[PDB]
Design an enzyme around this catalytic site. Structure first.
Site, short mmCIF file in Angstrom:
data_model
loop_
_atom_site.label_atom_id
_atom_site.label_comp_id
_atom_site.label_asym_id
_atom_site.label_seq_id
_atom_site.Cartn_x
_atom_site.Cartn_y
_atom_site.Cartn_z
N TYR A 134 0.88 -1.17 0.00
CA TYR A 134 0.00 0.00 0.00
C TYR A 134 0.91 1.21 0.00
O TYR A 134 1.75 1.36 0.89
CB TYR A 134 -0.86 -0.03 1.26
CG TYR A 134 -1.76 1.16 1.50
CD1 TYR A 134 -1.26 2.35 2.04
CD2 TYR A 134 -3.13 1.08 1.25
CE1 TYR A 134 -2.08 3.43 2.31
CE2 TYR A 134 -3.97 2.16 1.51
CZ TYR A 134 -3.44 3.33 2.05
OH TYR A 134 -4.23 4.42 2.31
N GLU A 167 -0.56 4.58 -1.38
CA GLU A 167 -1.61 5.55 -1.14
C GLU A 167 -2.94 4.91 -1.42
O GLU A 167 -3.02 3.95 -2.18
CB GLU A 167 -1.42 6.81 -2.00
CG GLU A 167 -2.24 7.98 -1.46
CD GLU A 167 -1.83 9.35 -2.01
OE1 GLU A 167 -1.16 9.43 -3.07
OE2 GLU A 167 -2.23 10.35 -1.36
N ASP A 219 -1.46 11.04 -28.31
CA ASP A 219 -1.60 9.70 -27.74
C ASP A 219 -0.62 8.82 -28.49
O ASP A 219 -0.86 8.42 -29.63
CB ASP A 219 -3.03 9.20 -27.91
CG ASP A 219 -3.26 7.80 -27.31
OD1 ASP A 219 -2.26 7.10 -27.02
OD2 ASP A 219 -4.44 7.41 -27.16
N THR A 231 0.08 3.99 -23.50
CA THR A 231 0.06 2.69 -22.84
C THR A 231 1.52 2.35 -22.51
O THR A 231 2.45 2.94 -23.05
CB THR A 231 -0.55 1.62 -23.76
OG1 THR A 231 0.05 1.68 -25.05
CG2 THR A 231 -2.00 1.82 -23.90
N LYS A 275 2.23 -2.40 -25.49
CA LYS A 275 2.64 -2.13 -26.87
C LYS A 275 4.13 -1.77 -27.14
O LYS A 275 5.00 -2.55 -26.89
CB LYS A 275 1.66 -1.09 -27.46
CG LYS A 275 0.23 -1.26 -26.98
CD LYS A 275 -0.71 -0.43 -27.89
CE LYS A 275 -2.11 -0.74 -27.38
NZ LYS A 275 -2.91 0.47 -27.43
N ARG A 286 1.08 -3.97 -18.52
CA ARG A 286 -0.16 -3.31 -18.97
C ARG A 286 -0.46 -2.16 -18.02
O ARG A 286 -0.61 -2.36 -16.84
CB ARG A 286 -1.31 -4.30 -19.04
CG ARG A 286 -1.03 -5.40 -20.04
CD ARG A 286 -2.22 -6.28 -20.34
NE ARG A 286 -3.00 -5.67 -21.40
CZ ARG A 286 -2.79 -5.82 -22.71
NH1 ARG A 286 -1.78 -6.59 -23.15
NH2 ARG A 286 -3.56 -5.22 -23.57
#
Lengths: 452, 452, 452, 452
Positions: free
Chosen positions: D53, D55, D208, D234, D237, D243
């Site tokens: 953990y 945040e 993008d 991303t 790719k 991912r």
């Protein structure tokens, strides 16, 4: 060049106007939102002022030729402020709104973004559609389409605004705007408490004084201008002017907003085009009259006449919503009498007693209104006093008795079955209705009526 | 009881109205959206019809006492349909909208959801604010606040709607509603092409015929009702009626939608309250006239007069936007003459010629419009013919020469500089303005003016 | 071709992970939303499943090569249904959401329109931020930006949801969706009452079980699937899976809506792209285990351990919100002890006890949270029992006493000044914190930690 | 408790991963968005970081707290800036987005209000769905639900973005945000021209770079950071990471907006809960590798391999959209070959060649995609060079020939009937598919594959 009068140019319209004039003269006009405006107002409204385009504000117009229109609009603004005892450095006014509903929508447009939150009095509890109204299946008011409205309610057991519950729900819902004012609220409004609640959530506070504007002008009721940011009104009803609207606003910044600039821009270019200067003319006329001692006497008589009528209805054992009234109107809860307002409205209308059905707190069905709303302004304008309003009460009582009798006689249980029965040429209580109508018209036709 | 007339009750307002009547009489009113309504219309508008509350539709009201109001509204609806040669089984009409802007907003409320997409003609290219307008800084029109508007434009080199570009941009933007119609467009509109473009994206198609309604009723221009779903209009302007609005709609379902129900509900209870029955009365009067052979003759004369003015202005070597007009207005591109419309408008107004400044396609400064809009309807109503409109052009030319001379002589470079200079008591061209004014007034005062 | 292990490829990241292994081993993890996932989950998450693009649903993808990814998603769906004892004819599940907040936002997108109304438990009363949260001047949650949220609240005197007030406010606000579930609510939810209230306004009803999903799966708490339409959850907290989300939905139409198609389309293509098949693999692993008797025993120990902690804290004279707990967490009101949760959180963190400061009902400001939230799931996974949780309560109490002593030494009243004091290298209660840390670490290091 | 490995805990999930590992090994993975991430990345993602953990909701801002400091997140941020050759005084990065689509949605939430206008490349012309997509029937993307999207298009004769038309349509539509970048665009972007157009309407400008991020990091393609305000991506790719997603932003105010604060608040707590530290671990690993000479050589080989494939496909008489490629993909227009992408994708998948059907500019319907998208990154990662990509082109050609033969044997036009035919156990071209599959697999299995 041919410019005939109405009787020559259009016999059918001429005839219809004459029928309506005939009807107004002989009827007891008890619709609380109706009045009889003056010959002077009508002459200004039916004038050449209609021909001019004057988009913008005085001295700030899009088109030429507006020297006299500007004098008129400035005069109208000055008279609006004077009629409500306002200092022109603290308060501004826009006299261009086309009616009460557009005046409200211009305010929302001025100070809110689409989908911002609004609270107003619930429609079935005496509110107006333009403060917001949604059913289980649709957004009915444009206010509830473009903004997010949530109602506040009367305590249904009392018929007075539940200020404690408004306080709690305002804290949860966090409206940007709280609206005070109503279409069928018979008591005066606790404006100090509205201010406390608005400040609790940083909301703008507006009063829609459509129904009570003249009573406020005459200092008969409390002054919302002591507490609110913005005031809207119709110019017909209480003020006894032409069909139009006005918006009053503080000129000091409110929550960091220049209300003058926002409201004026919302009216034009936001929502309207050219002002209706003929209406603005009529409004200026009516606002001059609003300052007169006779207008002050008239408004006191309005409240005394409503009181006389209410007392006599109660003596006939009718229940009144909230138990009475502090203003120009009363709401009769007909349920204890064993009938609804839709049935009673139709019979009374057939006897030349004109009023409207109105929902009552506790009504199961929105499609069957439990009460009737009655107002004194229109017949008070004609010069009726307290004794004549007691007679009005007796005539209403007679009408309700006929309605009750008609209800028992109709086999069908539905409002539409009642309507078909009373409107049929074989309607068996026709003679009771005629006898009542004779007395109603015998009262009404003793009195003058203003107009051209 | 006191019901004094206007002269007795309010000498200040009475005097203003007299001054405005007389200003109208002695001026050349060339504002294309202005006309002079009839005595008969004014008589209806200035009647007791103003006193009645009648929320709802004929036969389905929320108050008693509406027998005669219902007769009038039905008559008005049937006359509206007849004036535009419409079969009542295929077309319906709402005659309650308070003006052109509310008429349009009711349509959008009826058929669109908030933030749905609209295309209208761009404001700087002759469009109306109510079809949408946004600057780089803000959403100016209410339409652009509550809906998503994107303009279509004229071809800037021709001054005609760029239909090919609308076709392309509609395919990308996917408007739910396309609006045809304009405030300052001098040519007839290709309604068939609009229908092709609307169908390409499944859009509703509306015509706003405010400026051309009378020309359509008289079959001088093409009939939009052959191609569109919905037609809105002002009742003033081209139709020469009272200040109000109307919405016409197909009664067959369009894209699955019952337009009658949608539009009627949007008007009331959606956006408005009580109809203005005095205005509806005036509207019925004008719609009767609109069907007459004289109105047809009038509308043909409007076009002939505009053509006579246009041609004479072209003889004085003015450039017209689009090269001319098919209708009641012309747009003068003043830039090649070396001046703008703001300056010319003011001088002409000082000489009792009233028109308005107007943006020209290709104007760099939105603040400083490069043209003037001139319309023939109002002076045609007074009985002026082609010879007189040729004299009007000469007088305009004289005023533009004075304006050019004034523009040269002012040191200040801004419009407000030009205004201060022309209004100074030492204004060196005052005698030229007065001389022009004498000629203008000597022409105008030869013709009667309608009204009470 | 080179494909080194992490220790060779990225020594710095390898070192960081080793430090995190140390921290996890040494600390008492009492963050109520935390847990320890298994080695088996981690090995699925850290596999070649991460390489595959699989937009769409099984057997209906927009990429080839998905035979085995299809296999896995179906298995995961089957196991999710079996873990919650659901009939697949009645319930479906989408296992693609990337986390709890996007799972919730996908539900809203599926069943609501922008600006539709939602009610959820107020954040300062232990609600989830993704159910809606607005401050006095901003919409903080995306939920409150795109939808209109209004909270419901606890009865501050009992610490239980004020169902009576929710009944009233729902009737006024008319939510389209009501959400049950909380981040810091120590009691079970009255699902029957939520159903009653939802049905009173025709609302959809959702449970967000993120914090309690394992307790529901193990039948420790009541079953929301008996009453609600839609259930959302995270996968990491209570289920001890990988970080992810799921949405369960009725397959029978709800208020005329096919929830399966609506929800699936909102997840993809609406809001997400390609599913994270490595996460789905890990989820499938945890859902197998979730069906086992040992998982059921674990969940009962979770509640027993929380009860043991709760009771010992009450013996140390701490006030618990609602007087105890039915679940995995306690919310301690530290106000009567004379200190806030921010100061206590920090001191406990320095002593290797991790938990959260948390707002408490009655707090004046979110800036000074009055409480701490403490949960048993993580340390129960490591094998701690009831006696060890009593020892944890004792350790927390020691930490609160140090915090109070620290508070008295700090000059300022600002939380920042406290943080600076306690972190300063010579902080004069360092030895006390060190002594507490030794006790904390001496408990923790007796227990193993799952994982690779 | 137990902590069994995956093979013991869940033999079914273990078996599925075994099958997927074999499929990845045996296939030519030509999906342009796919890649093979490293063993080191997988080891980080499959670590105890999932139990870390850092945040969690509601977050430090809710309590008025400081910025959260985390060693792994900071490292990740530093490495991201370094990989893209960015000055940290001018650019910041948020590494918390869970994927590409939520990264984009967070940007919109940060800098736009609901229903603000966005332009992106049209989906049928190679755009991404998250940049906006609406059909005639519905708003398919969440982007098009919460914002008002309008696409820009390619010049269909050249296959290149129609920059001239974008200039025109942007001026009319006035987007608040223009998005550059694509899922299936084979050319580099003219960033200077996007900047010119964005500045023409005062729009924010975003790139993008999901499909091309590695080519940008390696300076193979032009740098969007020279011109745009915001870059999203991303991490899986082109970067070959786990991912996930990232958002880069200018640190200087852009149109008066602090992008850093806006973006960070939109990600968390606006739209997500706590970060996925396991993913951030893997991201940090791939961003280290992204700075290496070997990564730069790899990215150059990606382009060379795509060129070898493209050129060989042209030798086989295939038309390529835009006539070729500057990047990692080609878009083959199959219309001249007499067959669509859906049929071809299926046959190729059956022969272990995985790619995507894709719309081609000029296609009449999205239901029948005219082309296929083929990418080099994944097989380049395994070590294939130019000769091998020429072989790949030959193998694709063989599969297209099989697809055409299959099409002639199927009765009717429906893709379902084609699918039933080719999946039938006795499919008469089964031996041809098997012979192709053997060649495909004989190529693929010569090369290693990264991963645990």
């Amino acid at each position: 060049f041919l410019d005939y009068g109405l009787s020559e140019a259009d016999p059918d319209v001429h005839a219809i106007i004459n029928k309506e004039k005939d009807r107004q003269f002989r009827s007891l006009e008890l619709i609380a939102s109706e009045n009889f405006t003056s010959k002077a107002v009508m002459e200004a409204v039916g004038s050449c002022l209609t021909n001019k385009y004057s988009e913008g504000l005085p001295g700030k117009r899009y088109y030429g030729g507006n020297e006299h229109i500007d004098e008129l609009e400035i005069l109208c603004q000055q008279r609006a402020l004077a009629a409500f005892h306002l200092d022109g450095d603290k308060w501004g006014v826009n006299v261009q709104p086309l009616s009460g509903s557009p005046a409200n929508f211009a305010v929302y447009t001025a100070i809110l973004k689409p989908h911002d939150r609004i609270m107003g009095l619930d429609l079935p509890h005496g509110g107006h559609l333009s403060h917001g109204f949604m059913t289980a299946k649709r957004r009915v008011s444009g206010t509830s389409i473009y903004f997010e409205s949530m109602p506040y309610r009367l305590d249904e057991s009392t018929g007075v605004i539940d200020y404690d519950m408004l306080e709690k729900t305002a804290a949860l819902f966090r409206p940007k705007l709280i609206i005070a004012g109503a279409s069928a609220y018979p008591r005066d409004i606790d404006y100090a408490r509205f201010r406390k609640i608005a400040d609790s959530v940083g909301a703008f506070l507006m009063m829609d004084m459509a129904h009570v504007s003249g009573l406020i002008a005459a200092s008969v009721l409390a002054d919302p201008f002591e507490f609110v940011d913005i005031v809207t009104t119709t110019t017909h009803k209480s003020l006894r002017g032409p069909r139009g609207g006005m918006i009053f606003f503080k000129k000091d910044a409110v929550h960091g907003v220049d209300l003058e600039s926002a409201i004026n821009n919302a009216v034009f270019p936001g929502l309207q085009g050219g002002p209706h200067n003929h209406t603005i003319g009529g409004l200026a006329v009516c606002l001059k009259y609003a300052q007169s001692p006779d207008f002050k006497n008239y408004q006191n008589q309005v409240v005394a006449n409503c009181r006389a009528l209410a007392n006599r209805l109660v003596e006939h054992e009718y229940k009144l919503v909230s138990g009475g009234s502090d203003n120009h109107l009363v709401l009769v809860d007909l349920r204890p009498s064993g009938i609804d307002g839709a049935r009673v409205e139709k019979i009374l209308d057939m006897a030349s007693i004109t009023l409207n059905k109105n929902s009552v707190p506790g009504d199961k069905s929105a499609l069957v209104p439990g009460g009737i709303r009655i107002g004194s302004p229109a017949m008070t304008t004609r010069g009726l006093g307290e004794k004549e309003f007691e007679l009005i009460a007796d005539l209403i009582h007679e009408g309700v008795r006929i309605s009750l009798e008609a209800k028992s006689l109709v086999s069908g249980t539905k409002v539409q079955d009642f309507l078909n029965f009373v409107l049929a040429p074989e309607f068996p209580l026709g003679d009771k209705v005629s006898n009542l109508r004779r007395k109603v018209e015998a009262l009404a036709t003793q009195y003058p009526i203003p107009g051209v």
